[PDB]
Curated annotation (Swiss-Prot), chain A:
It comes from Severe acute respiratory syndrome coronavirus 2. Changing N36K: In strain: Omicron/BA.1, Omicron/BA.2, Omicron/BA.2.12.1, Omicron/BA.2.75, Omicron/BA.4, Omicron/BA.5, Omicron/BQ.1.1, Omicron/XBB.1.5, Omicron/EG.5.1. Precursor of the fusion protein processed in the biosynthesis of the S protein and the formation of virus particle. Mediates fusion of the virion and cellular membranes by functioning as a class I viral fusion protein. Contains two viral fusion peptides that are unmasked after cleavage. The S2/S2' cleavage occurs during virus entry at the cell membrane by host TMPRSS2 or during endocytosis by host CSTL. The gene is S. It comes from the Viruses. This is Spike protein S2. Disulfide bonds join C10-C32, C15-C21.
Length: 48, 49
């Protein structure tokens, strides 16, 4: 019924503790923001 | 960065905040100071001698 709720941060996972790397991640736009909303919706549906 | 309420508008890209829980960011504690630990300075080659 319930599946393990996992929210992965694409800011830390892609670039560990790096600001300049994060600047390169911002070049890809919402890919980070979109992948977070997908795992967030999973965590909400598992609660539903 | 003014208020946590305003962080919701910037994450959702909307000036209207609907009722509910929203994750607007992920906090991370930055390092306070740099730690340097190196091996003993002995076992040199005696250039001074």
């Amino acid at each position: 019924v319930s599946m393990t709720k996992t929210s992965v941060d694409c800011t830390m996972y892609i670039c560990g503790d790096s600001t300049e790397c994060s600047n390169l991640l911002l070049q890809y736009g919402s890919f980070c923001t979109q992948l977070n909303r997908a795992l967030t919706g999973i965590a909400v549906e598992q609660d539903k | 960065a003014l208020d946590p309420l305003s962080e919701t508008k910037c994450t959702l890209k909307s000036f209207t905040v609907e009722k509910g829980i929203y994750q607007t960011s992920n906090f991370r504690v930055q390092p306070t100071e740099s730690i340097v630990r190196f091996p003993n300075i002995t076992n040199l080659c005696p250039f001074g001698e």
